[PDB]
Design a protein around this ligand. Structure first.
Ligand code: DSH
Ligand code: DSH
Lengths: 282, 282
């Protein structure tokens, strides 16, 4: 678990490498119906949330992933009013989504109530999202939830992990296409281009067969394997240009929203990939 | 050093975090006049070169840093013919520099002959640089070497214990002197996730010496926090580092066998997360 003051993250999906974070205080460690939940105060990354032994967020750097996964799709849609978030138990994505004036309603489907309880206590900076009046919280498996919906959402965001398994079925993308309005867009966690370029290539070919516009973007974040993570973006609107935001933010807006990673130039740059990845996907 | 099949990298300059790489075979472990030199074959990153306990390169990901530190300055200069590299014992930067037709001569000043010998054996993919006919190899401390030169180079690259002399503030002024009247330089420039404060100071200092100063970054899994930055300065007041004066065609990128760098990557590399853009520009 914790060895000699350090928590080390290992997983077969990134063999031969590992991030360790020095620990100041074990805060919590319980098994819910669904996953092993471990929280600690780290020496230099604030509070750290670990699920089934994978670091899922830290207070120091969560703002990059949270802001990008929210703003990439929202600023690529002309008028996002109804939004669905799958997963995102910590509240952080919700936090970022509700900052948009155009958004009237956000539905969140999270499978584990306990993650919600732990975050409210140990990740208050993220869990502040739950105080939004736009929230309709739904407990349950997002896969099954998606079948309940048709032509319902402008934007869907999947903020996944285990239990996230149902979310890696190939019909999930088709279920999402169905749940989306006619010009809806979606954003899912999309693999690290330094770790699983092969999988990004497959996922992209599959999505392109379902959607007229498909794109891949990435952001940096020290505490995810290899220091970065990617996003899969799909649109049912054939005129969507993910690379150039249809809703550019002014500096006033960026300041008002208190963004610390995202802005309109970051948006554009996020789609500019290293040659090896650009070649593979294009 | 190696514990239970894993090498862990710790340093006070990134407290509370650590990358470990799983080890398949210890290949080499000797102290030169200058530094502790450790090479191993890792399970998933190829051969790994460690100097004084800091990972300095791996075969799997060295191409990003090597290509960017070389091409960032070279493609920002209209006609780079004489080039100086400080450090770069492994040969990798030299490898990338000599691919440029305009470059007639490359001088390299490396302080430790042993690093050169180890790389030739254990990093052949990098050390192939030494086979170039354009190379003038010089052994010695780059700080003292810089004093020997005036109005001599179009481009200087610093690929940096013993690197201490290279962190004295007069080094930048020494470099300005050694450069031709429109020369440019590129130095390793700190991680914006780790030492934003230091990047801000360095930039204010350089701006007081050069009419054009810029900061760029690239990703690389095995450097702390998964990325590293570059400080760029030009004595040419019309230099625009953000838009390459020498754009590469797709043919060229293919001919040069680049795996990270291209002209769009060049431009995107200067697009920083909002927190860093704010700190360097407000
Ligand atoms: N914020 C950074 C990373 C997100 S952590 C992954 C989150 O998604 C939830 N989750 C996992 N599988 C799920 C499923 N099938 N349906 C709904 N929620 C799920 C899980 O409970 C956790 O809250
Ligand atoms: N390629 C990725 C990282 C480069 S590793 C740093 C390299 O710079 C050399 N070096 C260190 N201090 C030096 C100095 N003062 N003068 C010249 N060379 C030096 C050192 O011997 C090593 O080869």
């Amino acid at each position: 678990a914790i060895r000699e003051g350090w928590f080390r993250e290992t997983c077969s999906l990134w063999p031969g490498q590992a991030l360790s974070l020095q620990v100041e205080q074990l805060l919590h460690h319980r098994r819910s119906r669904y996953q092993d939940i471990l929280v600690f105060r780290s020496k230099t990354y604030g509070n750290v949330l670990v699920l089934d032994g994978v670091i899922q967020c830290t207070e120091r750097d969560e703002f990059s992933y949270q802001e990008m996964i929210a703003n990439l799709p929202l600023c690529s849609h002309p008028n996002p009013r109804k939004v669905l978030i799958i997963g995102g138990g910590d509240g952080g994505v919700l936090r970022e989504v509700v900052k948009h004036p155009s958004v009237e309603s956000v539905v969140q489907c999270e499978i584990d109530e306990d993650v919600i309880q732990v975050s409210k206590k140990f990740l208050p900076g993220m869990a502040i999202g739950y105080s939004s009046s736009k929230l309709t919280l739904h407990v349950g498996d997002g896969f099954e939830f998606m079948k309940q919906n048709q032509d319902a959402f402008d934007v869907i965001i999947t903020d996944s992990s285990g239990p996230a398994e149902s979310l890696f079925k190939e019909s999930y993308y088709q279920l999402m296409k169905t749940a989306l309005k006619e010009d809806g867009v979606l954003c899912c966690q999309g693999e690290c281009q330094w770790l699983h370029l092969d999988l990004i290539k497959e996922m992209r070919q599959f999505c392109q067969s379902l959607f007229p516009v498909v794109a891949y973007a990435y952001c940096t974040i020290p505490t995810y394997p290899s220091g970065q993570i990617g996003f899969m973006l799909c649109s049912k609107n054939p005129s969507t240009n993910f690379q150039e935001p249809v809703q550019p933010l002014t500096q006033q807006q960026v300041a008002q929203m208190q963004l610390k990673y995202y802005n309109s130039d970051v948006h554009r740059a996020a789609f500019v990939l290293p040659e090896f990845a650009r070649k593979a996907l294009n």
